[PDB]
Structure 1
Amino acid sequence: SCTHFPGNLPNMLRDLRDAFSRVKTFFQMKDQLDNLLLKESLLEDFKGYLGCQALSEMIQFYLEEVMPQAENQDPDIKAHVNSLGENLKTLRLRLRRCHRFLPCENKSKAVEQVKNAFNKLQEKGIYKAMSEFDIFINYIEAYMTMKIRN
């Protein structure tokens, strides 16, 4: 569940950092380049209204590209790295389940029930969903006006 986020996160970030220091020296000794990769631009995107999408992508980036390819190269830390990954997923989870921290990863209630209601029809649902396309267009047009007007 979610206590619409009071503060359980602090410790989760700490767990993350704690999980990192066990691979810190390794990768930092290993990385002999001095240019910054996570440009402050990333931070400005995070501090931007596309932020959520920025945060989800980067998190996906590490869990899918980076961490996987790293444990790939040197299986020594493959353990400690994977653990940082589990530690990173436990973070994401607690995020997309509360206080508008990761809305850009949350399924929609209505869209689920409406999908269930449909699937529970079949032949009949394929017809009622299409014959309601006008209402659909209407809702979309409503969503839009919530931006071009009050």
Structure 2
Amino acid sequence: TQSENSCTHFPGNLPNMLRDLRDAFSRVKTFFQMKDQLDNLLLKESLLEDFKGYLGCQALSEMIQFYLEEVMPQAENQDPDIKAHVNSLGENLKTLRLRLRRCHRFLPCENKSKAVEQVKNAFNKLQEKGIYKAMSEFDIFINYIEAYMTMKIRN
């Protein structure tokens, strides 16, 4: 929403959170280095370049979702004694994700427009009448799209 959070100890506790995250991976680092028997690199440096440019929020968001949904669910089931530690590592990753999304627009690609939620709330209460009113104001929707476009093509 119109961002800027209201979070205490922020952004001062960010380094502390990354240390908690590195300490949780340390509890599973040996198991996984021994299972991995290849010397090639997967997380290439082009990934770092994308994190630092204009699509960085989106590339980081997609990589957090990739690890929580396509990597962590199978790793956790690799041995009964690494399961609690792999789910704790996932929780520190989700706790970090939540702090950047909630506080002062640090993961803006994941925030949602409060004005859109309100229009959708009002539309749903008008029921059938919402369809006719959204269509009758379509020209106001074109005026809003043009304002977004002019803002980029104008000086």
Q: CA deviation at 1:29?
A: 2.2
Whole-angstrom CA distance in 2 between matches of 1:74 and 1:120: 51
**Contact kept? 1:16, 1:84, Cα under 8 Å:** yes
What CA RMSD, in Å, does the superposition of the two structures yield over aligned residues? 1.6
Q: CA deviation at 1:79?
A: 1.1
Deviations 1:21-80 (A, max 9, x none): 000111112222121111011000001100110000000000000011111333330110
Whole-angstrom CA distance in 1 between matches of 2:42 and 2:15: 26
State which drifts further: 55-64 or 97-106.
97-106
User: Alignment identity in percent?
Assistant: 100
Whole-angstrom CA distance in 2 between matches of 1:142 and 1:106: 21
**Contact kept? 1:71, 1:78, Cα under 8 Å:** yes
**Contact kept? 1:95, 1:101, Cα under 8 Å:** yes
Q: CA deviation at 1:6?
A: 2.8
Aligned residues: 150
Q: CA deviation at 1:108?
A: 0.7
Q: CA deviation at 1:4?
A: 9.8
Q: CA deviation at 1:109?
A: 0.7
Q: Where does the alignment leave 5 or more consecutive residues of structure 1 unmatched?
A: none
Which TM-score applies when normalising by structure 1?
Answer: 0.93
Q: Where does the alignment leave 5 or more consecutive residues of structure 2 unmatched?
A: 1-5
Q: CA deviation at 1:129?
A: 1.1
* SS at 2:121 equivalent: helix
Q: CA deviation at 1:3?
A: 5.1
2:45 matched to 1:32? no
